[model samples]
Target: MAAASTEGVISNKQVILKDYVTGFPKESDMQLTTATTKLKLPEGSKGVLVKNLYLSCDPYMRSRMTKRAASFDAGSPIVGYGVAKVLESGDPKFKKGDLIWGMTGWEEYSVITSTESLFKIQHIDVPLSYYTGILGMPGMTAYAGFYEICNPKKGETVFVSAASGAVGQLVGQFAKLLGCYVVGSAGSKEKVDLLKNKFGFDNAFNYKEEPDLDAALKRYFPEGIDIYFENVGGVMLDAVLPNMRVHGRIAVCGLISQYNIDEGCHNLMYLIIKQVRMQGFLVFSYYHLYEKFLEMVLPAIKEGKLTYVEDVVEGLESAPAALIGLYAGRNVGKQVVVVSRE
Candidate 1:
């Protein structure tokens, strides 16, 4: 994406970043154009203008370049989580100065009208940036996708790929909370250690170290995976397909492995014979439950009962690299960027 000309107006500092992305992206691909102070609330706009603080970088953003790119428009602004304060509002639910967390722009200030799915954060005593990770969509994705989609049971052998990622790390922990024997896969030995040690997975291995994914699954999940949290697709899913136990459930929360590919994964045979109940879901489909997700996450966060990890980048200028970093396994946990502060 080419950088937009701002001239002298500071109306907004937008990242006109590259309009196209192939596989891995670089920080140079994104540029901060300007920042604005003026905002208008149309007579019936009902939108709130917020000054964004923290922003989340996720692997799924890579898919935004595909046919599914509507959620994120190139040369417009990146879409993801951010901690922001309403500087102006036309909605009653959100007023000026209200600190909220939800879908905000990659820029410093964003306009939000619909409060239907927005969450009013009641707790800011902990790190406010957490609203982007453990306390935000990634957190909810972990909670809902694992508990709801997978319908996990105690001691069910579970396999999670990209295990140390934003949602993956939590899913691993949440599985442990349910007494499930968990095994996770990551790209490096460091992340593998985080999966086994920090996330409390029963076992973990670096997929990079295991050339044959089928062997990796069987070696770790001898009894077979009853719940598979599918993060990376392609070969990993190929391996996991044959190893699923009867009535096993697979939650397609993400497919990091195939995001950059010209074509998606190709193992349809695995889903058929395995009788695996595979479902793909978005956090928006489950947004109505955001409040409940926070209820569970906040208390656990405060008591230190919940453990979350994050990989932080300093500014919006780095958004592109931050996102591509997730794809390349450079990030160890939930990838986030600090846009600004109160």
Candidate 2:
């Protein structure tokens, strides 16, 4: 609705949010619609137009599904992180041919008025899809949560929940790379194996199969956890609290487990007694360090010291279903939707 329309110029395929989501999101909650847009930027409009290439499906998107405290407007195109190429720009920050990754709509083309949110892609030799995962927001989230929040030290004991997911997998590997003894928990056996073998986590377990999360954590971390990267909260947080060492730190990255439900923590007493430090963060706050993050991570990525996995759907038609699948834990890694090849 923001962009001016062209009578018969360009038809944009968009994924429109049918209504505000209440419980777990359903594929039917979103509908595909066609919209017309002028290929040219409006006169004197300070905005950038981008053709969507890839979209990221993150758990945080669930929060935006509800009207309360939601970021994107309801009854419009579902908005989230994506990789796109600049088609036109009225802003001086970008050029027509520049590729960027940032907050964009789930549509074929989006006229982004908030050009500040976009980041120009510098490295192109790597797969452009990585911008939807490791090289983009999730990658920055992982780095800031570990290096900045956790204040990790060599030979420390680290534990991560949802370890096989986008941010969690990278957190585990980052801890390992720091010479810390790391362990992770995932929803399925396949994902658990991915944490241990591929991500090089010292140990991993299938949380779905484990009846007693307390016992499972004890078995892997008998000495105590020095740092806990909290992804899925609720019971996992309760279990992790008791196993944390004195003066331990917990980085509350997200709570995928508690997204659709109302729940409360039952372990605040442990924090008071142990003097543990727990902090919650938003990735947007760390965007200023984007260049530093790229410098630190890009070399490792090229050297094979770091790796990332993605679960991608081929087209925009499948984006809604793939997004809904995330709440069900159906995706093995970072869930992404490929809108177009070029």
Candidate 3:
């Protein structure tokens, strides 16, 4: 870990990666970097400084490094979702000790400005850390993707690649809640079993072992798919396009398959002929729906109507391993890191 300097009134002890990555990213690509953990409003500053307690380890963070050929910049705090508490506020709406969630850095504390997308958490009965996933951006991703993007209705067939992932698990479950028949594809047997048993998907298949994805989709959708929540792209998308129903909708939340691929345009023909309405969007783009998302998802969670699973890693030192775990397809559920207790 790098040492903090005595130069600033506000500083943060951050997890700094040692350069960007290509192919499988190892913990060696990252090292802890430290600075004085700051929690004070800079004089006349309109924003607040927060102590981040939980850091989310999401697969999409892998695509952020362009220097690694993934398109993300270097020397930036590894970006992802998180749950934090405002320790000092110069902003009017936020105050000291207020709980919040949004785009935050991986560190002990952060001073966020521009304040536009941060949502203060209200519901406390459920786990506060869900702000990183289920009750946060990923929640909105699944909700908007399934209902708004696809307009999925009862008994409609739906397929999710990376179904056991942070967003995919919820997408499948959310579909089931809407009375849609659903199936998810994962990269491992344990995750495959999880989709079927724990997350409660009607069926699940491991894509790694299955050479024929078109056959896999057909085997599950049997009749055809009304909605496809794309998590992995490339050959998977190529296979899915031919099997989709007419007027079907595809929400491109992520294309993990292509994130690591040096090659591009694997689904050009299928994309054209299918003539489907495929939309790729960032979750922040649909954040206007947060109030509606919380109103709906919170009740489901409280009533046990919706279930979520997470792979929580304790300690800040383990943060690098946790984030990298998502890329190796080792996480059985949403990966989250606990960095502080108070």
Candidate 4:
């Protein structure tokens, strides 16, 4: 199946980083360029050449845009996570038709050499796009962060920041599944509605409407919060700190609120006073448990015990706009760029 020319010198459309960005990202920061590459893997290389199927738009990509994190090289394809099908391979573990989800270039095809975190898809029953979302990285983050870090118990109160995001929405639902009362906060009322209605969160609120972050948390969790799935830090973290119960667990995922801006939160005193246990984790740390996570979540998905939402934008031309929309809260749910089907 030749989606493009399955031979030498095929036109590869790439989302190239124009330059390093400061503050919020703009669509102009990245420009699309056409390049050419061979369909076959380079001889003597153990890498697999994959046809990019779906690309993920995540807030953490913002960090990579700056020099502070992994720099998005100017005039080069921006690197991130995506789901791809093996077009050709020199690696023994993969063949010409295996579906995989992991690190790849934001282009039509990615020659992935680092297969350390990569996995071949075994289940074709669910949406293959799910490997880029709920069944993939974000799913693992929510599961590992909630179970391994939060140490949750039934009847506890849980709060999730940026609750409408890819990871946040899942965390909220996972909390509810464990019999915890979960409240989520997002930037818009529509997202709040989705949180409360679609994701089955016990309650949700638009953080933009709440002038007082502390007051908003107070209203939702007056009894004090037990587990905090921290996605946004700064003021939200400060607000969450004062409301956490004794020995409350805080799973620090990503500080989306403090991604580029510096809104300092002065709530360190509460950590000591409450004897709270706060831990930050990277999903990479839990790669060894991928099969175990699939065993647990696959059934939940098939049995209707869990659900997910996505805001899909088609074509590689929309990649920049899709990614830029993340910081502005323009996307309602998980933002994905569909490059191709099959």
Candidate 5:
């Protein structure tokens, strides 16, 4: 090899998508590769260079693997939410050594040019990895979906699907804290137990064990459900529609089940018959309420009134597996990949 001048150049490990995915995604669809890059930012660049600490594996990311205009490009790094430390910055809003959370690439280091979505990390007393789950996008998703969209009242009956996952778990807990009778459905017994015992949901069930989803919902919600935090769609949506009370609210956070396989809803007639308000929302739309959300959540966490669970993987190489695990219900809680501790 020719002798080369080395100053601030470093090896960067990245997870790159090999091709557009069809149906369920597999770990082999992603490949771990390394490239060399300078640690310093280029002149006149109005961006921040960061070392990724934690990466979030969310259900929505599966959609990005399909061939679409907005989808992640083949032969490039996959993108998602993460917690990072700024190593250098050319932007006035950010400085070196600042911790932040936002949309980032699945790599050891990234030069984030889009600074609009990035938020500086404030609370350091709690676990920093929490920014990938409870203190970040998923937390805000649950808040905006349940409180702003549903507008739930005390003692109301609430049902959350995929309730042990990142956003769903928080939604159940939020409903409970408001004195609402909450029920959640998960894929496994352990998740069901976590929903009822750890998160304080009034009742939870294993959806996989229930052959008739309509009957399962009716058994738990004999009176009727006032609010439904819709995560898994398909048959679950059809079941909840007939069981909703008059003037009930349904917050459509995500349809993890229908993301890979196309499905149709057969219960539009119930929306009109029951006078139910079903609203589909994106978390970014309600980001204005983030400060207000932190004010309420931070205190609850400190006092042990709120509990957050996370399933963490050790290295950047495990990111592909961690992400694919979400589809199979292999993750117990929020799925996070730790790139670095510091």
Candidate 6:
């Protein structure tokens, strides 16, 4: 069957960056284009060709939209983390039909040469789409940021900003499991409810409705915050600074607020006075803890001690809009684009 298919080529639908973006990104900044790829890998090629299944839409991808040495090309297919099935492979580590999650193109099929970034999916008992969210990059992000960076302890007070998004939601639940008093700030009333009711956050508030962020944080954290999972920066960071307790540990994750435009933090003086430790991290630097992360998270998931939520859209045609929605806080949980079901 593989030998017969190797003789043909197929049309690949892709989402390409139209140009580098300056301010807030729009759907029009990307264009859907069709390209073709051979069904089989070239002779002596040490790469894998995969059929893209699920694509993740993350906030960090916004940084790639701007012109930079490491940014997405102006007229090439954009790339991000995705779940896929190996259609063909020249690398010995992967074989035909192996499921994987890693950096892949925003297209139907991809010739992935960077095998070092790829990981074979070992847990298919859960939803494969999970690899694009909880079981993949975002999950590892929550694990490393909270466990390693924050150094959380039982009964501590934890605050998560942009708490309804992909990474923040997991961080909130992880804090709760550690017996921390967890409060989260979300964009809307619905997400706020989800944080409190569904995700088991102790308390959640709508940041949009709160006129003064510093006052809002003080209301939820009267004693003071011991750990801060900072996802939204700017005013949120400023608010958290003053509210942090002595020797507070802050894991600086994403600064979604400053992703489009930018802002500086004014209350950073609290770091000196309060002896707070604020450290920024990238998920890529923490993959060494992935197996360890799965050890804790998988059991929690199986025992119903943890939960995940995702916002899914259908097709590559919907990808541009799905990605742009992240900056607008339109996604309730993890934003995913379903390129194909199987």
Q: In the order shown, what is each candidate's alpha-carbon RMSD?
A: 4.1, 3.1, 3.4, 2.5, 1.7, 2.7
- Model 3 agreement with the true structure over 259-315: per-residue lDDT tens digits: 665545456565566667888877767788889888888888888888899888887
Number of the top candidate by TM-score?
Answer: 5
Ranking by lDDT: 5, 6, 2, 4, 3, 1
The lDDT values for all models are 0.80, 0.91, 0.81, 0.89, 0.92, 0.91
How close to the true structure is residue 320 of candidate 2, measured as C-alpha lDDT? 94
In candidate 3, list every pair of residues with a backbone clash. 64-72, 65-72, 66-71, 66-72
TM-scores, all models, native as reference: 0.89, 0.96, 0.89, 0.95, 0.97, 0.96
Backbone clashes under 3 angstroms, per model: 6, 0, 4, 0, 0, 0
lDDT tens digits, residue span 97-172, model 6: 8999999999999989858879998888888999998999999999989988999999999999989888999999
Give one digit per residue, the lDDT tens place, for model 5 in 165-184. 99999999989999999999
Native-structure RMSD, model 1: 4.1
Judge candidate 2 against the unseen true structure and give its global Cα lDDT, from 0 to 1: 0.91
Worst 10 residues of 6 by lDDT: 1-10
Misplaced by over 4 Å in model 2 are 1-8
Candidate 4: residue pairs that collide: none
Off by over 4 Å in 4: 1-7
The weakest ten consecutive residues by lDDT in model 3 span 65-74
lDDT of 1: 0.80
Which residue pairs overlap in candidate 5's backbone?
Answer: none
